Design a protein around this ligand. Sequence first.
Ligand SMILES: Nc1ncnc2c1ncn2[C@@H]1O[C@H](COP(=O)(O)OP(=O)(O)OP(=O)(O)O)[C@@H](O)[C@H]1O
Ligand SMILES: [Mg+2]
Ligand SMILES: [Zn+2]
Ligand SMILES: [Zn+2]
Length: 590
Amino acid sequence: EGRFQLVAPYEPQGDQPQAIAKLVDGLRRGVKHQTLLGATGTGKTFTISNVIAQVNKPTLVIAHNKTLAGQLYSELKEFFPHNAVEYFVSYYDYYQPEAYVPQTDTYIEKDAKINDEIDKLRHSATSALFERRDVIIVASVSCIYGLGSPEEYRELVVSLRVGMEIERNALLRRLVDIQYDRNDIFRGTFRVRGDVVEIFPASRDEHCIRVEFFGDEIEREVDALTGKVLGEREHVAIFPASHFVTREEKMRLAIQNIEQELEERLAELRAQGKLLEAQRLEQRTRYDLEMMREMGFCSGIENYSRHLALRPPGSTPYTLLDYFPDDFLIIVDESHVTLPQLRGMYNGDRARKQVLVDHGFRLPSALDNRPLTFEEFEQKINQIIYVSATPGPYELEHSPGVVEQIIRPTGLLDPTIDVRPTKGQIDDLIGEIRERVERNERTLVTTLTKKMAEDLTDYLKEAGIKVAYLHSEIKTLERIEIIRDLRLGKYDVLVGINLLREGLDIPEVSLVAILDADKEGFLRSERSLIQTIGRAARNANGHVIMYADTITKSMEIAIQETKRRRAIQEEYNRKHGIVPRTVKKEIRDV
Ligand SMILES: Nc1ncnc2c1ncn2[C@@H]1O[C@H](COP(=O)(O)OP(=O)(O)OP(=O)(O)O)[C@@H](O)[C@H]1O
Ligand SMILES: [Mg+2]
Ligand SMILES: [Zn+2]
Ligand SMILES: [Zn+2]
């Protein structure tokens, strides 16, 4: 196939169209980097899907954390339910990276249970890229992680057609030769019928363990289930059950190589050191090899990825970006945060693994199993598009100007900003607060020190006001619980240090306080401030008060931009006759 079908209730509102089409044209004109500058709540996720469909290409949308990768998922689902949309994540978004604390001389094993759901979609994701051209995969920074080679996937593939002759025990083998999927057992798996005309209940294949069970009697091919039959076929494809699978003849040789190293490493470790003389690792190396020649896989296999692949030391790893057709597209959400973090992933891995090698719990060759370097990520790009309200210096210095999109569909507008002295700052912020309770409106405050927030909360309650918390990480459960508590009348105010903590996109909030605007901090930067400001644009009377003594260069930039931004949204509601009205949202249950 290969046709994108973009469903949707609305239509391009704001200045979406200018945006969309500008990007599009720019792909086509063959440009590498483009940056989308979209304000908060102006609808980026949607604008994006439009461009996607105009270029009919397959893409990976990299988000910077589990949750986000999630929202983007479902969202993009409602947009295209007739196309391929997968969710590539990993156990980096949870467990412990088998490390070692030397001082406390305390070891920590790779304790990570296989959470099947994950694996399920990891496999559907890979597969999809060799069948259709209409695929979409949302993923974490984790996509730049080492993975089995792709070619050795489009090779160990079981192409099933009609008219060809294969034993009833011949395919049963290429089948176990790929770490069998579900051809064993709560039964006999896929054993029945027999002869030249067999049965074979090829089930649990992860690439579609959503109960599909493919049956092929003397190819045959007819999608089934745990109940009854459905949907007809004449050509199927079965995929490996591991991303790190290898061919026997190759494994045989890898093993010898592993060995030459473990040997010749103890000789160099013998001479220089005496860290348990050198050895101690022999316990698991050898224990690992024995479990290897006996069975294709083993314990921490992944560690021997470079060796198994049969590629020279230092080699750059294989990644999900290598499974995408030669001309694909990558969307990077919240790019000013993602990018930087995905940058120092190699450094932190290398750091925590070199330790295990000095202490000797894995060998040099284990270093070769790592994430990409930022340059290795670069050399792999075909064409990208960065999305963010606060684009970083990288995107701007590589991109040819930006592509502005700053008009919300409701026609709401970035607040107005005030800046007042630190003297008498509290009795002032109380007065400007009482007045919001009298108009049924909520507030949000921010400090720098957890002892300044604390110093306030009480001061506030002692003023006769329903007030919020003072503790940063108050779980996530009770956390979502008190957000709900606010947009309801429970409280009128709310103090926090970090307000950029998602969930805080509330409409009943009309005023936002920034108590140490001119101080030093990450939470007081050109980018970070603008972002805190947008928390006051979910309303028709959004205002921001900045309490300070001086006007930092950061403060300046923010204010300057918000201004300009607001002007243009206003001259626009003019030409069109729109009166800004506050968004409404329902108030569910936790
Ligand atoms: N053209 C449109 N017509 C109607 N609704 C739209 C349109 N475009 C976008 N929306 C809406 O805008 C909302 C938020 O858009 P989007 O997800 O991009 O917010 P955002 O840009 O991510 O905000 P933030 O930067 O704060 O995260 C959604 O509720 C979405 O339905
Ligand atoms: Mg977003
Ligand atoms: Zn460069
Ligand atoms: Zn218009």
